[PDB]
Amino acid sequence: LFQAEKDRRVLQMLRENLEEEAIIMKDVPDWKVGESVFHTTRWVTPMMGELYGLRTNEEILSATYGFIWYT
Amino acid sequence: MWFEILPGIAVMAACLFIPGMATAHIHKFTNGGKEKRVAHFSYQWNLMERDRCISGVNRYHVTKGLENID
Amino acid sequence: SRGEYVVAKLDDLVNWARRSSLWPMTFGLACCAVEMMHMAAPRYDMDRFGVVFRASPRQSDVMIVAGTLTNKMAPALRKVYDQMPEPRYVVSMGSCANGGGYYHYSYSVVRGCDRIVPVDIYVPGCPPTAEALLYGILQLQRKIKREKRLRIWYRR
Amino acid sequence: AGRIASFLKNAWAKEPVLVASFAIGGLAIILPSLSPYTNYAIRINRATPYNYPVPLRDDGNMPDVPSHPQDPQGPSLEWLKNL
Amino acid sequence: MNIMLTLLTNVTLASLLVLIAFWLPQLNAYSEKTSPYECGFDPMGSARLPFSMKFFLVAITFLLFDLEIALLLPLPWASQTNNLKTMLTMALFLLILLAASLAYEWTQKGLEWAE
Amino acid sequence: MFMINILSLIIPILLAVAFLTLVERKVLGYMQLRKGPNVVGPYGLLQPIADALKLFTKEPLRPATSSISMFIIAPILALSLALTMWVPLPMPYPLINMNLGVLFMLAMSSLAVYSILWSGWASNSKYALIGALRAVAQTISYEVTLAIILLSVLLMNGSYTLSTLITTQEHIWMIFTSWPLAMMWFISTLAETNRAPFDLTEGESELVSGFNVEYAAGPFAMFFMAEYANIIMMNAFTAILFLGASHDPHTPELYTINFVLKTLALTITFLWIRASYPRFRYDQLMHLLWKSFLPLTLALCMWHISLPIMTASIPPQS
Amino acid sequence: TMYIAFILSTIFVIGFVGFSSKPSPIYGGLGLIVSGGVGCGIVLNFGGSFLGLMVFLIYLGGMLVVFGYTTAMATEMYPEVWVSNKTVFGAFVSGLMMEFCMVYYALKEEEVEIIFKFNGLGDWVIYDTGDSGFFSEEAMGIAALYSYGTWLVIVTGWSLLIGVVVIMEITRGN
Amino acid sequence: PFFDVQKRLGLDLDRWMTIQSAEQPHKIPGRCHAFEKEWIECAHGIGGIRAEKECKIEFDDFVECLLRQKTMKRLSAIKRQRDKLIKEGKYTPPPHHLGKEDPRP
Amino acid sequence: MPLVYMNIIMAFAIALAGLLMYRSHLMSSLLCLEGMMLSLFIMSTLIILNTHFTLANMMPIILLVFAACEAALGLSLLVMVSNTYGTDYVQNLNLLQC
């Protein structure tokens, strides 16, 4: 169950980031929104920068350090 | 006699009671009357995060059940 | 007045602690230091009153000059007295420290430690009994009780 | 043999700490090879499911692979249950 | 985060105690009071002169044995492996080599302080 | 609320340290046929307060030859680490729940060693230097033996988590399982806390007050508080490690009472030992650990590695 | 973000500047102890609690021996501190200035050194999204020293035993 | 120079530890296991020269997974453009990016 | 590459420049030598932990072990030099010439 929830949540955050990138990088001359940095078309696991990039520092900190700092 | 040592030992014991009991009470106070969740592993941490997400009040200890699924 | 009352209570608190925690330096010179051992002994337990021997002069409040002070020892006694941090008190025990003693008219003896250090209490005897030294210690405590440093400062 | 006994008695009178140390170390080295429960410890370690048991794609020729967890096929921990 | 806050609290409390100690009481300082202590007489030499260490070899052996115990510390997790025989063999190998080092030094008189 | 918890962990420990000073004075007095403090307050209950007030209202002096920066830092480091050692202890709930609660204790103790060394060196006096080097040798010996003993006993546990220690000792006592390691651990804790017969860093008979000879007033009181806090903390760790109390999750006060009683018993045993025995020579202390404890410790470490395997009793990892 | 790893790395570099300016082995050991503790913090943030605590404990033990040795072997009448000497203070200030310059350049722009290219962004950005479950990957990998790595244990133990023999032989004299 | 005693005797002394796509305890995967596997399979059996000439795409993907330089460049560019747009008030972040949403479990 | 790696490599470079620039004491250079291996340990564990190279987690421990062996060797040589010359100064190691 948690695997399915994780997949849905990750894909949703990726789609939201893509929409915000489309809104932002609309006047950049040479910029294609959603372009991959890998030659291969295989699915690549996102890093924390790709998911919690355009989000609040609270969410960023919880995602990146919440487990390690939880004592 | 030797029992005049006891009041000092009694005071020292009373002082040593405070930390543990205070920690227990504060753990129950800030976790909804339950034990503070132990998260020694990423699985337990992810469970806590999911509990925070589903609660709707941004607090993992607010537990939801069948009345919430339907 | 409010400030007068506050400073009185404050120096009562400060004098109580100093009188109730006395830390003599382990400093014995002659036969008078055996009666000091007997004051430390179970019969007249000095630790009962809050009086504890410490070896370092830096951690000592009272110097009990117990024994004959010689010309070859006076520099060392003054040195350890100076190295005691303030507030510091001196109890001169027995005839040899009070004045000359049996060795007053001698080429090698200082006629009283009060030529070297400021003495607060003089305990007479050769040697003073352990009860006599204990009486001197309690008299020193009562002398500390009458100190009014903050009361002098407020009116200063 | 007599020399061995004399040496041991001298050591027990002079270095009981060293005698005890060597006895404990020697027993620690030797006993595991004779214990019948070493294999049980290995089996208990193998039986711990740290990660997910990814299922196999059924080809129709896997009679020893269960179709359900509660099917009779598959490893059994009944030995560990009564242990 | 919580551990950082705890360390900050402890350090701040200790520093406040030092500050109160050095600023509350009346101070009277002079060259004789602050002189070094050597039982009533002046020190002949300096406290910064070399001070012979009679156990210099035991210190080096301590460095080596300290890293031996650093090797030994992850044993509680090593006991969860399926290769129990190999794990036990290597653990006993390390401990036996440590014992061999101790025996060699002891018999060669490395544990005796210099005279 | 966590700051309130930190205060609730700190202040009671300092109060317990003061009354441990009182209790030690009275226990030694009665073992020496005296009475100890009974004049200052009712049964001498205000004696620690009087001593603390006197020390912090007395004048602290910096020696002319001292290095002032590390002269000041050393008591700060000592007291800070003494207060820090308490945060992972489960009573029954730790303030800070660490996955490796034991290695944290070892590391912080090894750090707390350096307060003695730096206070002795920065004082710039011969007696202080001698006390510092006695500390160096003492730490050598006790450190190696302590690490091996902890490894073995925690190998009977399964991990380095003290709550897991409670769960392990749910049924019987680790002291019943491993009493030889318990004896060597107790001796090593004495050597680690610098308690008699191992009070060599501050040995009044040989050195005039050892490493803190040049310390006065408040900075001396900080070293005293740190030493007594370390005594209580090590006894608490020993009680948790070898005398496991029963835990009821719905009434955690029972575990707290049991833990406090066991800790007090061990601390009073420390005072008893100080009253009973003479003082070692630090070379004989080094020869005791290396030539007596270390061989037995290595043999018992081998035994306690092999025993779970040969009997199929390997503890769970979590 | 909170830049905790960056702040700790800066303190790490500062401690290195200290003991490499080399005032005297007492303060060199003090700076090395500070750097060891700060590096323990850095790797604790990155994930390795055992590795951090282990390096901290090992360096605490190692610097204890160095104190005793510098008391006996490497001491002089007036031990040098950072402000006591012109050379020591010059080197310390040079190191601090270099660290400050590089930190400022990296924060202001993506600084490419003459050796390596560095991007000024999140240490939190570089992390991985995935997680483990009910075990510590670092602990399991370290514990694999006994199941795997039989060869490493053999060479390491042989080296330690020969190290004891060597230190006994070097200091023999005669 | 290199005496391949391991290959000759069938031993395994450090080849287990050489790569992160090898057998790991509890089957824990590396961060770039798939990329490293693809590069190794591409470069197997053709030597260093041809492997560097021909498996360059796979190696570039592997290095990108390892170091994440292009990804950080893209993220920094997006961050700079967003900050510039916010400075002049031309862009408004959505509530789900400002923290006014309920994510999935 | 993050700035953390830059700082760790900078610390290694500082410790290397410290070793190569002796002043008088051999002990200070030994401390500079111990700092280099500390920076190597930190850099290696940062690289390994980030990439989830599980089997490489034991490498920093071996690195520490051989750091200890080097430190022991250096201290032994230092005590021999000090016994011969009275000080650990590097100016006394001038009997042999190039």
Ligand SMILES: COC1=C(OC)C(=O)C(C/C=C(\C)CC/C=C(\C)CC/C=C(\C)CC/C=C(\C)CC/C=C(\C)CC/C=C(\C)CC/C=C(\C)CC/C=C(/C)CC/C=C(\C)CCC=C(C)C)=C(C)C1=O
């Ligand atoms: C020179 O020849 C001679 C000899 O040959 C040497 C001799 O032998 C002798 C004979 C003498 C002997 C034989 C003596 C030998 C005897 C012995 C060796 C044994 C005797 C015993 C000792 C020596 C032990 C000595 C011990 C001492 C001195 C310890 C005393 C020191 C202290 C108590 C100070 C340290 C404690 C402190 C600082 C306590 C601090 C506590 C706190 C700060 C806690 C408070 C914290 C807070 C945050 C406060 C706020 C709290 C709140 C608000 C809570 C309140 C809330 C409520 C609800 C109440 C003679 C005469 C001689 O001549």
Ligand SMILES: CCCCCCCCCCCCCCCCCC(=O)OC[C@H](COP(=O)([O-])OCC[N+](C)(C)C)OC(=O)CCCCCCCCCCCCCCCCC
């Ligand atoms: C227990 C651990 C923590 C301890 C914390 C502090 C414990 C003690 C608390 C009560 C202290 C009472 C004041 C004692 C001051 C020292 C006395 C002295 O030097 O007298 C001689 C001097 C004499 O001054 P003078 O001007 O007459 O002398 C001139 C100099 N000679 C001697 C050469 C002539 O007294 C003073 O200077 C008085 C200063 C004001 C006193 C009151 C201020 C302090 C009030 C304290 C309230 C509590 C909170 C703040 C303190 C810190 C705690 C949080």
Ligand SMILES: CCCCCCCCCCCCCCCCCC(=O)OC[C@H](COP(=O)([O-])OCC[N+](C)(C)C)OC(=O)CCCCCCCCCCCCCCCCC
């Ligand atoms: C807001 C506070 C500002 C000031 C902070 C000052 C910090 C100074 C020390 C820096 C290094 C230690 C903190 C690193 C950052 C946090 C690490 C972290 O998240 O740890 C979680 C971990 C959690 O423990 P864990 O190992 O169980 O983690 C795994 C389990 N999870 C992930 C679920 C938490 O904490 C620890 O492991 C504790 C280790 C503490 C190590 C401390 C080393 C340095 C000691 C310095 C002592 C100085 C004494 C005073 C000297 C004064 C002299 C005058």
Ligand SMILES: CCCCCCCCCCCCCCCCCC(=O)OC[C@H](COP(=O)([O-])OCC[N+](C)(C)C)OC(=O)CCCCCCCCCCCCCCCCC
């Ligand atoms: C060579 C001799 C080896 C001897 C090894 C054993 C040494 C024991 C040293 C004990 C020191 C205790 C110091 C603190 C005192 C605390 C007092 C207290 O609160 O007690 C109440 C406490 C009760 O609080 P409790 O909850 O902590 O006790 C039970 C704890 N559990 C169940 C969680 C493990 O203890 C008891 O009332 C019972 C104590 C024994 C518990 C273990 C099970 C029974 C074992 C019976 C067989 C014993 C065989 C050996 C006997 C003879 C040994 C020579």
Ligand SMILES: CCCCCCCCCCCCCCCCC[C@@H](O)O[C@H](CO[C@H](O)CCCCCCCCCCCCCCC)COP(=O)(O)OCC[N+](C)(C)C
């Ligand atoms: C450890 C942490 C401490 C932190 C600081 C807090 C301090 C807490 C306050 C402690 C107060 C202790 C009170 C001491 C009570 C004195 C006991 C009584 O006996 O004293 C009497 C009176 O003593 C003094 O007159 C007063 C001392 C106590 C009053 C101090 C002032 C009030 C304290 C409150 C602080 C001040 C603030 C006031 C407003 C600013 C004299 O008796 P004494 O002669 O010796 O006994 C001899 C023995 N005999 C009887 C057998 C012969």
Ligand SMILES: CCCCCCCC/C=C/CCCCCCCC(=O)OC[C@H](COP(=O)(O)OCCN)OC(=O)CCCCCCC/C=C/CCCCCCCC
């Ligand atoms: C493992 C050791 C062999 C390694 C050889 C490496 C090259 C040689 C360098 C020396 C290293 C080893 C030196 C250890 C022995 C040297 C000390 C010695 O000579 O005496 C040993 C001394 C004897 O006492 P005396 O000589 O009579 O002196 C007392 C006089 N009243 O005591 C000993 O025998 C201890 C020897 C080592 C203790 C451990 C014994 C090891 C036995 C276990 C088998 C090891 C197999 C390794 C695989 C382990 C698999 C589980």
Ligand code: SF4
């Ligand atoms: S006064 Fe009498 S008893 Fe005291 S030292 Fe002099 S001769 Fe001895």
